[PDB]
């Protein structure tokens, strides 16, 4: 029923992950939200459940394969499968919890885990942050073989959380912000494993935020400031949507957007 978008970390390339991440937030947004240049993802309230989730099924050069389910809301990695076993992230509220029951339903062994999904619980269980966790085409293949090894008892819980990590930042992360695509497609060029720079973690910490500055502004000014940080970690003050057309390419729906309001 929901759709499937296909990769693999195996030969992958800049155009590879390019057409990869193209597809996923196609298939995300729908169009009908488009607020400064920029796409907004569906609203929550009213969403039929038939159209809620979408299907990442990632293979890697190892022959194996898992499928991530997302959130079209918020592109929020919610779960996943491998081969018989799918696992989900300790859901928000009743809503989400049902929502969830329409995933993998042909799946011999459901399981959700008692935690939570956010980046504060995966790292505090992976024992590392972010700034730390190297990502790229290599960190992504052998997350792929970590996640489907851990029903078989092959993947430790520190491992199983920074394979998540991995995959939620070159998927949704990527997929929400064209300047971290970017920054993956980089290290994809050139084969070469990093950790996140300050540039990449604020952004993903003010995704929301930023979100909601956009829409709530005025004619596209910000009645506040964003900071952000650039890859030294010195202050980037976010003042107006323009300087972010180029950096973010999907935001979560926060308000309605005001009337057009021309002169």
């Known amino acids: 029923q929901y759709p499937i978008i296909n990769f693999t970390t195996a030969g992958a ?23 400064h240049e920029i796409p907004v993802l569906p609203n929550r309230v ?9 299907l990442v099924e990632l293979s890697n050069h190892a022959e194996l394969s898992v499928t991530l389910a997302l959130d079209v ?35 011999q062994n459901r399981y959700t885990f008692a935690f939570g999904g956010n980046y504060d619980r995966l790292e505090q269980l992976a024992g590392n942050l972010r700034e730390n966790i190297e990502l790229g085409n290599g960190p992504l293949e ?13 993947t430790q819980l520190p491992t199983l959380a920074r394979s998540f990590i991995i995959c939620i930042q070159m998927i949704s ?24 720079d300050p540039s990449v973690i604020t952004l993903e910490n003010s995704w929301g935020r930023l979100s909601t500055a956009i ?10 400031p964003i900071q952000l940080q650039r890859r030294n970690g010195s202050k980037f003050s976010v ?3 323009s300087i972010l057309i180029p950096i973010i390419a999907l935001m979560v729906y926060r308000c309605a957007p005001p009337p057009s309001s021309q002169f």
């Open 13 to 35: 390339t800049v155009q590879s992950y390019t057409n990869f991440i193209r597809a996923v937030r196609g298939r995300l947004t729908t169009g009908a939200d488009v607020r």
């Open 46 to 54: 009213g969403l039929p459940i038939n159209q809620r989730f979408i």
């Open 73 to 107: 809301t918020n592109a929020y990695v919610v779960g996943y499968r491998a081969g018989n076993s799918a696992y989900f992230f300790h859901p928000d509220n009743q809503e989400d919890a049902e929502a969830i029951t329409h995933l993998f339903t042909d799946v």
């Open 142 to 154: 052998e997350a792929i073989s970590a996640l489907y090894y851990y029903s078989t008892g092959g």
């Open 173 to 196: 992360e990527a997929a929400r912000f064209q300047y971290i695509e970017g920054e993956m497609r980089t290290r994809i060029r050139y084969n070469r494993r990093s950790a996140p």
């Open 215 to 224: 829409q709530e502004s005025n004619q596209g000014a910000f009645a506040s």
């Open 239 to 241: 003042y107006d949507v």
